[PDB]
Design an enzyme around this catalytic site. Structure first.
Site, PDB file in Angstrom:
ATOM      1  N   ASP A  57       0.857  -1.176   0.000  1.00 25.65           N
ATOM      2  CA  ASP A  57       0.000   0.000   0.000  1.00 25.65           C
ATOM      3  C   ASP A  57       0.894   1.227   0.000  1.00 25.65           C
ATOM      4  O   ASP A  57       1.673   1.430   0.938  1.00 25.65           O
ATOM      5  CB  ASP A  57      -0.931   0.014   1.214  1.00 25.65           C
ATOM      6  N   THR A  90      -4.479   6.295  -4.552  1.00 26.17           N
ATOM      7  CA  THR A  90      -3.265   6.977  -4.122  1.00 26.17           C
ATOM      8  C   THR A  90      -2.040   6.443  -4.846  1.00 26.17           C
ATOM      9  O   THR A  90      -1.014   7.127  -4.916  1.00 26.17           O
ATOM     10  CB  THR A  90      -3.094   6.820  -2.612  1.00 26.17           C
ATOM     11  N   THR A  91      -2.125   5.226  -5.384  1.00 28.29           N
ATOM     12  CA  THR A  91      -0.986   4.640  -6.078  1.00 28.29           C
ATOM     13  C   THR A  91      -0.792   5.265  -7.454  1.00 28.29           C
ATOM     14  O   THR A  91       0.344   5.438  -7.910  1.00 28.29           O
ATOM     15  CB  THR A  91      -1.179   3.131  -6.205  1.00 28.29           C
ATOM     16  N   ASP A 394     -13.623  -6.439  -0.006  1.00 25.83           N
ATOM     17  CA  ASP A 394     -13.283  -5.647  -1.181  1.00 25.83           C
ATOM     18  C   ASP A 394     -14.443  -5.611  -2.165  1.00 25.83           C
ATOM     19  O   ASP A 394     -14.702  -4.584  -2.800  1.00 25.83           O
ATOM     20  CB  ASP A 394     -12.025  -6.208  -1.836  1.00 25.83           C
TER      21      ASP A 394
END
Lengths: 534, 513, 510
Positions: A57, A90-91, A394
């Site tokens: 992450d 965010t990646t 998820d």
């Protein structure tokens, strides 16, 4: 290091310090490339000298890192802005912007007016959002060939527990509807973290069970106290009845232990009297929290003391608000001196105690003033139940977000494929200098499906092969077309032409990711007067 | 901080760290053990057959040497043995498989090949797993002696055979309808001072050494009822509040002796109401124990709240405040024996409990203070067997021949499951056979030609049933050699070695913030 | 070395590593030299002249090494080339990666003799199953299509882009005319570059093709006796003498009168002795020329060193400069003498046809000789590929599809035996694998994508790679069922000679 070190503030004044920060930003971006997506690689990162952690992450990685460059710094700042929004996307904002701040200094230099390259970035950002609203070609989860079931089954196929996820598809469809806790706009979707999910180990591995109404995990095998009486009224008890130490009224100064002895014989009697006045009020199923000693448990089981003890507080706060109960309307004591009132009770149509998987659970069928549902699973072992828990959440989150935005987009670099292309087609229509503002922007989109493919060992070259082979020039229309496609599944890193999968992220997480990734290249430009200080 | 290391240099740096650890420990493995000698940085020699004592004292390198300790401490926590076995497996797969698969550059299919290798392992493992009788001690004595005979010490192995085979059968879960493997808090080893192996009695139950140390306290009561507060003990433990004089040394002594005097007044109810065991989880003074001699009651001190539940459910103790004013007592018997033996002035209270959730700690005796620890070492290898025979009555033969049998089973499925998968899947099959090759290397022959004779043995007549000796280097029946491989070690060490090799493959970057 | 003695260039490191490392580097350029090529090799020579080529026999003769292990194997690659045609690219690349696998057995601790005998058992068993992998034969060598079907692989082994037009054109230039019953020209097939008329306009001209311009009229008869002379005719120029610029010009006129009557009688004595064509390796005299037109004798203005020696072989003449009136000791053989305009150039055409004594010569037309001298290298091994000395050449799968067909058999055979030779039989099946792994890296994909499929297809014979998309992503290209063939004999020697070289160079430590 390049540039002079005689001056302070690490100032190199020009192309070297513009070549410095493109190295400082890319090395930050290169970390996320290994950890990109579900196939991204886990990094073991030492904290001080002996403390380590294993992460893929990227936001968790950037919390560990201590910046020593502004190119190191602003990438940590902009990514945490998307992190407090969701934490997802965010990646993507980190990897793209390293190429962007190579491209921005070359062209904002070339001003007729310096913000035109920046406005060309924002026009490219707004060109995306319009076609983002035009996407129904890939990623519908509001329906499918059957229902949200078709979305959830491929989402539960994306989260592997074997070949299963068929019975698990119906859980995700119920979860936004079993919850009724007030979101914004009163939407028919409702948050998926309020769902009472229970395990039951050792049965058919494919099997899953839906329960109408909430399901309480109550303990069996230690207690044998009366709990199996079928009611329609429950009582929720934030209470504890001990025999050992519940009352203190004599100081430790008095030289007579007889005074300490005689008040002990009164505290043991009121625990039995407490459950009598509760059952005299009208309750027949009560739900007691824990907090009693290990010596006081064994007296209640073999002799007889009506309760349901050590229930989960995470379910009990949900059920009491679900059934119409109150747990705080008579709490002024924690001992057996008060009586019980009729406003503390919960309401259901019936309260049946079904023993199943050798476990007697208390099923609150059809909670009143809000009718709900709960899901108890069926694995074959403990760890097999432990795998399917992470397989659920998820798919619980991604389906809830697609119900929010009606227009929804593919996930990963799948949606970026036409954005890499048809913005550059849009860039040529703008004509002049602002064209390569859009074009270098749309060029930098390509690395996101590429580096995830290398993490999936698919290696980026069939990925640029298929996605360009889809996109039709005569049919630049996406609609649902059999003449162009844009979808791509990321867990294999190979394009599986899918629109029900759980790998296609909605509009909302993507449009904000386009903002801060654009803004980060703008963020480095905001200097006036590069100087040193003594 | 700001730090980035480029890919291949770190994954290869993982290889160089792990394989060098896997070098000497592979030769420290088994009865063909070498010794890993650490010279002290302040001078001094240390060599053992355990590299974990060697590595944890010396400077551990960063890239892969830190993770191997972490997988070893999990391996040491559960079964203890096999920490030498885990670290030599993962680094061997890390060396042999990765380097050319780095050249073809795929992390992912290597990781999937570990999943293919672990599942092919289980299928061929259960077919050769031979059931032994858990109802027969001698069927269990043969395998529990095999784990102790890794050393040359076999004089008091049979003393370790007697105590452990019946204790762990009594150590069960809290779910109480279940067997398999015991838990370390519920099965402990402690040494009892003095004593002889002719007095080392087989203890199954829990011992309480915080019990009687003086003969006026509790003598031979079959239900030693542990007594908490509230009628025979009370809450007053303070002071009669004498004046506070800041300029006197005798003030601070008087306030502590007045604190003990109210503890004397608490035990006055212990005389009048007659318990047999009183407990205090905060610990009492030794001067409080002398008035309990006048009560003829033993004390229990320096314990916790959870120690008293697990013994009283086991030994049959009723949780009372008076035996004349009862409180819905517990079970009346769960104990097979009540015995208190003395060494010097120290009575050691034993109570043998039968199929019970007790926090067991067994009796062991040697002949001397150092040789009390030698018995204690033998019971450590004993309890790994007793949990495993509780876990798996089925178990495989082998002396490393099973490791070849796993290795050949992969190679057949390497050629059967044709595709892109087979090239990492066959490369890790090559890594397994190196370890028993090294065990027969110390035996001494053309060990590479024997390695061919290992593989020709496997598919033809016997996989590892007729196996190979690891003290002679000859293809022997491992059923007839009497040396057996623990099946749980065949489960666990293979499961741990594939997980570490995945994680060391995934990493290519380390930071320090 | 501990002492003053023992001069040697090999040893514990150098024999194990550096001998194989030297054979690695020579095989490093031949990773893509057989089968489909994107690889090209520019060379400046000992002549220091720019050429690009894809035949290793041109490359390796430019290459020099002091390593005798590296030096020996290129002779064995010639021995296959002396015997069969193309496949001399294969001999080095097969044995090169073969020896690299032998290092890994020496990493383990295997004895060298175990590695020596290990490939020898593998060499014999593969040669047993190899005629069982014969899939076709040249049933009709008179057919153009069956001949061109073989030739497309060897031209591809120089260049994939010209495999189809040349394989027809060579069969159009008739290697088909040989029955191959002991009939194969080695120098009457000699490729004749004609500059101009670019490379797709390369043509066919049976019988001996001479680029040199035909001077004078045509021969009196096509049945003429062929007189082949080293320098019969001369041309005069001189400079300052011992005393500068001699005392008169009268003897210059006196020497010039007898010079004309000398070359008058030279063309006369050839006309008297029966020869009606003269071959001049020297230049043409003007005084010799105008009597040769009246005598109706055809003349060649100039010839090189290669022009006379083919004529001394095929016609059977003797090459010597005639400072005397020439007589016939040359015995003209060709019964048909033509003049043709090939590349718009006056081309001397000699011609005769026999059953096992025919002539049929390759001629090429291209706008660049430096292109066309490499195109003929695709022709050079292709014509010698017809020399199997059999009509039915026992055609095997072309391209390299036999290699994965063999490698399935050998590692299965390697598993069944015991020993430490046991491992080198399994490594021998790996030696078939390395060449299509090196070719697919020129195709545009990784090897493990490709080599997984060619093992997974089955015993098929057809499945291979070319240089197409079918080579890249599916790795399936019909290199048997699309006009791509190889013969048994070229495959048989190239495995054999690479084995005997690699076993030889492995034993040496000095």
């Amino acid at each position: 290091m390049e540039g002079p070190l005689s001056v302070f503030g690490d100032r190199s004044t020009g192309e070297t310090i513009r070549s410095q920060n493109v190295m400082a930003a890319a090395s930050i971006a290169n970390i996320v490339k290994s950890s990109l997506g579900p196939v991204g690689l886990d990094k073991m990162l030492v904290d001080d000298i002996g403390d380590v952690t294993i992460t893929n992450d990227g936001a968790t990685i950037l919390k560990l890192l201590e910046v020593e460059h502004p190119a190191a710094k602003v990438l940590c700042e902009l990514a945490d802005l998307q992190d407090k929004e969701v934490g997802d996307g965010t990646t993507s904002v980190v990897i793209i912007a390293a190429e962007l701040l190579k491209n921005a200094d070359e062209l904002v230099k070339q001003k007729i007016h310096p913000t035109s390259v920046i406005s060309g970035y924002r026009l490219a950002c707004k060109e995306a959002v319009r076609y983002i609203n035009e996407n129904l070609i890939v990623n519908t989860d509001e329906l499918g060939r059957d229902c949200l079931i078709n979305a959830a089954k491929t989402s539960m196929s994306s989260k592997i527990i074997g070949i299963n996820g068929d019975f698990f598809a119906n859980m995700v469809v119920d979860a936004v509807l079993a919850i009724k806790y007030t979101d914004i706009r009163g939407q028919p979707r409702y948050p998926v973290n309020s769902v009472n999910i229970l395990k039951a180990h050792g049965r058919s591995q494919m099997e899953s069970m839906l329960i109408s109404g909430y399901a309480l995990n109550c303990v069996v095998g230690s207690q044998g106290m009366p709990k199996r009486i079928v009611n329609a009224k429950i009582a929720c008890l934030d209470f504890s009845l001990q025999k050992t130490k519940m009352k203190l009224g004599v100081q430790v100064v008095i030289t007579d232990p007889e005074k300490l002895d005689q008040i002990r014989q009164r505290e043991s009697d009121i625990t039995k009297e407490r459950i009598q006045k509760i059952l005299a009020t009208g309750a027949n199923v009560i739900l007691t929290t824990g907090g009693i000693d290990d010596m006081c448990l064994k007296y209640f089981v073999e002799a007889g003391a009506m309760a349901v003890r050590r229930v989960l507080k995470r379910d009990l706060k949900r059920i009491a608000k679900a059934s119409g109960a109150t747990i705080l309307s008579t709490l002024a004591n924690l001992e057996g001196e008060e009586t019980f009132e009729a406003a503390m009770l919960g309401q259901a149509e019936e309260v049946v105690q079904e023993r199943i998987c050798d476990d007697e659970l208390i099923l609150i069928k059809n909670t009143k003033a809000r009718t709900s549902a709960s899901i108890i699973l069926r694995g074959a072992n403990d760890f097999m139940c432990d795998e399917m828990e992470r397989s659920l959440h998820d798919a619980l989150c991604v389906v809830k977000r697609v119900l929010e935005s009606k227009s929804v987009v593919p996930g990963g670099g799948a949606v970026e494929a036409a954005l890499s292309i048809y913005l550059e087609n849009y860039a040529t229509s703008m004509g002049s200098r602002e064209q390569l503002a859009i074009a270098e922007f749309a060029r930098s989109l390509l690395v996101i499906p590429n580096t995830l493919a290398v993490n999936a060992a698919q290696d980026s070259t069939d990925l640029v092969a298929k996605l360009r082979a889809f996109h039709n020039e005569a049919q630049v229309n996406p609609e649902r077309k059999n003449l162009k496609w844009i979808g791509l599944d990321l867990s294999n890193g190979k394009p599986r032409d899918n629109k029900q999968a759980g790998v296609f992220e909605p509009t909302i997480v993507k449009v904000k990711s386009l903002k801060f990734a654009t803004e980060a290249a703008i963020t480095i430009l905001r200097i006036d007067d590069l100087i040193k200080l003594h | 901080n700001t730090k980035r290391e480029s890919g291949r240099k770190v994954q290869s740096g993982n290889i160089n760290a792990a394989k060098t650890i896997a070098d000497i420990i592979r030769t420290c493995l088994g009865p063909k053990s070498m010794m890993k000698m650490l010279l002290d940085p302040m001078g001094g020699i240390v060599m053992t057959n355990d590299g974990n004592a060697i590595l944890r004292e010396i400077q551990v390198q960063h890239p892969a040497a830190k993770s191997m300790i972490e997988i070893s401490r999990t391996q040491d926590e559960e079964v203890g043995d096999g920490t030498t076995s885990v670290i030599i497996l993962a680094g061997e797969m890390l060396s042999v498989a990765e380097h050319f698969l780095e050249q073809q550059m795929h992390p992912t299919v290597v990781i999937s090949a570990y999943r293919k290798a672990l599942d092919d392992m289980i299928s061929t493992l259960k077919k050769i797993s031979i059931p032994v009788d858990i109802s027969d001690s001698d069927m269990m004595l043969n395998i529990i002696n095999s784990s102790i005979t890794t050393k040359a010490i076999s004089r008091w192995s049979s003393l370790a055979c007697n105590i452990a085979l019946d204790a762990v059968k009594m150590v069960q879960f809290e779910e109480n309808g279940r067997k398999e493997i015991d838990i370390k808090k519920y099965a402990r080893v402690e040494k009892i001072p003095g004593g002889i192996i002719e007095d080392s009695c087989v203890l199954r139950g829990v011992m309480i050494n915080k019990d009687v140390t003086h003969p006026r306290m509790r003598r031979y009561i079959k239900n030693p009822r542990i007594v908490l507060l509230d009628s025979s003990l009370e809450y007053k433990k303070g002071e009669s509040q004498t004046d506070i004089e800041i300029t006197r040394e005798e003030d601070f002594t008087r306030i502590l002796q007045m604190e003990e005097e109210y503890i004397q007044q608490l035990c006055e109810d212990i005389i009048q109401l007659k318990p047999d065991v009183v407990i205090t989880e905060k610990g009492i003074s030794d001067l409080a124990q002398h008035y309990l001699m006048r009560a003829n009651i033993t004390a229990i001190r320096r314990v916790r709240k959870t120690d008293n539940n697990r013994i009283a459910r086991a030994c049959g103790a009723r949780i009372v405040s008076r035996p004349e004013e009862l409180r819905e007592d517990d079970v009346g018997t769960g104990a097979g024996l009540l015995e208190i033996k003395k060494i010097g002035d120290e009575y050691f209270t034993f109570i043998t409990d039968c199929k019970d959730p007790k926090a067991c700690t067994i009796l062991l005796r040697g002949a001397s203070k150092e040789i009390l620890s030698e018995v204690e070492r033998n019971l450590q290898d004993a309890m790994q067997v007793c949990r495993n025979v509780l876990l798996d009555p089925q178990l495989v033969p082998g002396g490393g021949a099973s490791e070849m049998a796993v290795a050949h089973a992969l190679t057949e499925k390497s050629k059967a499951m044709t595709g892109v998968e087979q090239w990492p899947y066959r490369a890790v099959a090559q890594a397994l056979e190196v370890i028993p090759r090294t065990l027969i290397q110390n035996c001494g022959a053309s060990t590479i030609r024997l390695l061919t004779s290992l593989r020709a043995k496997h598919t033809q007549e016997n996989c590892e049933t007729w196996g190979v000796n690891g003290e002679t280097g000859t293809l022997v029946d491992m059923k007839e050699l009497g040396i057996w491989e623990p099946l749980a070690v065949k489960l666990q060490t293979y499961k741990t070695a594939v997980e570490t090799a995945v994680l060391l493959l995934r990493i290519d970057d380390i930071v320090s913030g | 070395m501990l002492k003053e003695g023992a001069k040697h260039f090999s040893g514990l490191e150098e024999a194990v590593y550096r001998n194989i490392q030297a054979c690695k580097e020579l095989a490093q350029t031949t990773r893509t030299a057989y089968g489909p090529n994107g690889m090209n090799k520019m060379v400046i020579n000992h002549l220091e002249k720019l050429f690009v080529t894809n035949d290793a026999a041109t490359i390796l003769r430019e290459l020099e090494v002091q390593h005798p292990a590296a030096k020996m194997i290129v002779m064995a690659s010639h021995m296959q080339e002396q015997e069969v045609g193309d496949g001399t690219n294969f001999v080095l690349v097969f044995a090169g990666a073969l020896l690299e696998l032998a290092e890994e057995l020496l990493r383990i601790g295997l004895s060298v003799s175990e590695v020596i005998e290990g490939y020898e058992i593998a060499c014999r068993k593969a040669h047993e199953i190899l005629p069982n992998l014969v899939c076709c034969s040249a049933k009709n060598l008179r057919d153009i299509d069956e001949v061109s079907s073989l030739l497309r692989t060897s031209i591809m082994s120089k260049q994939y882009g010209n495999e189809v037009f040349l394989a027809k054109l060579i069969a159009q230039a008739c290697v088909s005319i040989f029955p191959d019953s002991g009939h194969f020209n080695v120098d009457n097939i000699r490729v004749c570059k004609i500059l101009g008329s670019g490379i797709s306009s390369s043509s066919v001209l049976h019988g001996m093709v001479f680029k040199k311009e035909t001077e004078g009229d045509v021969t009196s008869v096509k049945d003429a006796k062929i007189a082949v002379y080293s320098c019969p005719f001369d041309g005069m120029i001189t400079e300052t003498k011992g005393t500068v610029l001699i005392k008169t010009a009268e003897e210059l006129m006196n020497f010039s009168k007898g010079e004309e009557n000398l070359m008058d009688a030279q063309v006369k004595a050839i006309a008297d002795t029966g020869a009606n064509v003269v071959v001049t390796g020297g230049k043409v005299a003007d005084m010799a020329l105008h009597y040769a037109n009246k005598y109706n004798i055809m003349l060649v203005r100039l010839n090189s060193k290669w022009d006379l020696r083919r004529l001394c072989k095929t016609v059977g003449a003797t090459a010597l400069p005639r400072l005397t009136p020439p007589v016939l000791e040359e015995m003209g053989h060709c019964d048909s003498v033509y003049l043709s305009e090939v590349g718009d150039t006056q081309v001397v055409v000699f011609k005769h046809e026999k059953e096992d004594g025919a002539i049929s010569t390759i001629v090429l037309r291209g706008s660049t000789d430096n292109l066309m001298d490499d195109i003929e290298r695709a022709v050079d091994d292709g014509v010698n590929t017809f020399k199997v000395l059999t009509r039915d050449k026992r055609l095997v799968p072309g391209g390299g599809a036999t290699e994965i067909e063999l490698a399935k058999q050998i590692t299965s055979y390697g598993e069944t035996c015991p020993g430490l030779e046991q491992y080198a039989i399994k490594k021998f099946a790996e030696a078939f694998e390395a060449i299509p792994r090196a070719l697919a890296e020129n195709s545009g994909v990784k090897a493990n994508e490709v080599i997984s499929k060619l093992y997974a297809v089955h015993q098929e014979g057809n499945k291979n790679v070319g240089l197409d998309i079918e080579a890249e992503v599916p790795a399936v290209k019909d290199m048997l069922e699309a006009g791509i063939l190889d013969t048994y004999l070229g495959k048989y020697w190239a495995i054999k000679l690479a084995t005997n070289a690699a076993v030889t160079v492995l034993r040496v430590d000095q």
